[PDB]
Amino acid sequence: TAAIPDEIARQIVLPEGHKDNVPLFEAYRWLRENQPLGQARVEGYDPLWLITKYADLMEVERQPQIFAAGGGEDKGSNNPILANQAGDEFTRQLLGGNLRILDALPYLDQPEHSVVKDVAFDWFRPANLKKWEDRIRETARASIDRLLAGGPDLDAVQEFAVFFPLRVIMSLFGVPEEDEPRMMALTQDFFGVADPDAQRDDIEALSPDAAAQQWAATIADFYAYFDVLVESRRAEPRDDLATLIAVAKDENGEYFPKTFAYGWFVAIATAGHDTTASTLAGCLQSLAAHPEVLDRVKGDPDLIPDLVNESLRIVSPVKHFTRVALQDYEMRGQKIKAGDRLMLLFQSGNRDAEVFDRPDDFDIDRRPNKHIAFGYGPHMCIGQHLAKLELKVMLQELLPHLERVEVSGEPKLIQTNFVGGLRKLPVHLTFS
Ligand code: HEM
Structure with missing residues (x-):
């Protein structure tokens, strides 16, 4: 019944707790072994049930009519992406009483979620992605040609790994190559809201609601860019993913709202x-x-x-989404109350020793590999098949050209509790 101990709670809830994977993962592990379903009560945050166990992530995610992403019929009453309390108050001041700052799938509940997701579901199915494999492979090969040309010493992130997935998605999406640097800069602003090296110049960096101000500012910049793209594709459809989404109409024959x-x-x-x-x-x-x-x-x-x-299991770069209980619910001997918020810890589920033998070991012989890096339930990652195709194609083209990877300098992670991973990996490569 006791709250989670404060230093374990802070390690997982605060963005600064994710600066270093070692203490982060040790905090997930402490919970899984000692307090697998407890409530974090961190100053400045709502109370959160920390969902650390693989079975519990599946139990919550397969019951969307109990555990909502956006607050159910009171749309926008839950923020699916954890902000601090000051940040949710900033957003409620900006929007007028709610937190639905995007109409994107994570903010939606059924049946609205289901209607919207069906606009692009077929596009993202593995059989419908096969048509892009040759273009992906040509992009991987061009990226590898530049890697070989630039020599063996580099930051494997900013000087290699960031470019291939950006070129792939912008080409499929239909954004011109000259707009890639703008999309990269806005992505850094968006995933860097709490990272001290990724602060925007136009927000108060030290304000209690800084991350929420940065989130909102970045969304407004994306809206200005995407307004022009939606109007362009509605006026002149093309064979791109932008068009599929821009022209989509609802069951009454009306465009879905531009947002x-x-x-x-x-x-x-x-x-x-x-x-x-x-x-x-x-x-x-x-x-x-x-x-x-x-x-x-x-x-x-x-x-x-x-x-x-x-x-995917080891990196698990998407760390959480939040849910709210629409009714009281008993799980693992605990009484979740209606209105309580939950933090789904996908990285922790991916280290659950009840599911994975030697869960901290890098072991490619897990067959099947039961990872939950893409989540579960109706919100399960829509992009998973595109991600697995791009990673397969790039590794098929790259690995024959690599004899050895050495890390030659200090790796750096994005400081975030949301969408993280490396921002820097200094290497010395030995080419074949
Ligand atoms: C390594 C790559 C990726 C990982 C590990 C990943 C992981 C995730 C996870 C954990 C979720 C939340 C699932 C849940 O709420 O249960 C998610 C949602 C989502 N992801 Fe992925 N993702 C990846 C790649 C992509 C790509 C390539 C796209 C798009 C091209 C994408 C688009 C989305 C969208 C739109 C959602 C929201 C789904 C919803 O709420 O219904 N992801 N992703």
Whole structure:
């Protein structure tokens, strides 16, 4: 019944707690072993049930009519992405009483979620992504050509891994190549709201609501860009993902509101490349630590999907979404009350020893690899098949050209409790 101890709670709830993976993962582990379902009561935050166990993540996510993302019929009464209390008060002042700052899938509950998700569900299915594999492979090869040209010493993140997923999604999306640097800068603002090296110049960095001001400012910049793209594609449809979303109409034959397209576009333009870049950089970091794995996958390229799955489980770059209980609910001997918020800790589920043998080991021979890096339930990642295709294609093209990865300098993580991973990985590569 006791609250989670304050230093364990702060490690997971505060963005500064994610600056270093070692103490973060040790806090997840302490909970899984000692207090698998407790309430964090951190100053400045709402109370949060920390969902640390793999089984519990599935139990919550498969019951959306009990555990809502956006607050159910009171739309926007829950923020699916954890802000501090001051930040949710800023957003309620800006929007007028609610937190639904985007019409993107994470903010929506059924049945609205289901109607909106169906606009793009088919596009993202594996069979419908096959048509893009040759373009993806040509982009991977061009990126590898630049890696070989630039020599063996680099930041494997900012000087390699960020570019391939950005070019892939912008080409599929239909954003011109010259607009990639703007999308990259806005993505850093969006995922960097609480990172001290990613502060926008136009917000008060030290305000109690700074992250929420940065979130809102970045969304307004994306809206200005995507208004022009939606109007362009409605006027002249093209064979791109922008068009599919921009022209979408509801059951009454009316366009979905423009902000619904903007919501898809914000998710595509941010998660559509950043998570893949994080997983690729993480995989390279793990191949430096486990050179015998690089040797094995070069010897058997059919192991590449297994390498991708284990990189997803270990990196788990999307750390959480929040839920709110619409009714009282008993789980694991605890009484969640109506109105209580939950924090779904996907990285912790991915280290659950009840599911994974030696869960901190990098082991590509987990078959099946039961990871929950893409979440679960109706909100399960829509982009998962595109991410796994891009990572497979890039590793098929890259690994034959790598004999060894050495980390030659200090890795840096994005300081976030949301969408994180490496921002810097200094390497020395040995090419074949
Ligand atoms: C390594 C790559 C990725 C990882 C690990 C990842 C992980 C996740 C996770 C954990 C969730 C939340 C699921 C839940 O609420 O249960 C999610 C949601 C989502 N992801 Fe992915 N993602 C990846 C790539 C992508 C890509 C490539 C796209 C788009 C092209 C994308 C678009 C989305 C969207 C739109 C949502 C919201 C779904 C909803 O609420 O219904 N993701 N992702």
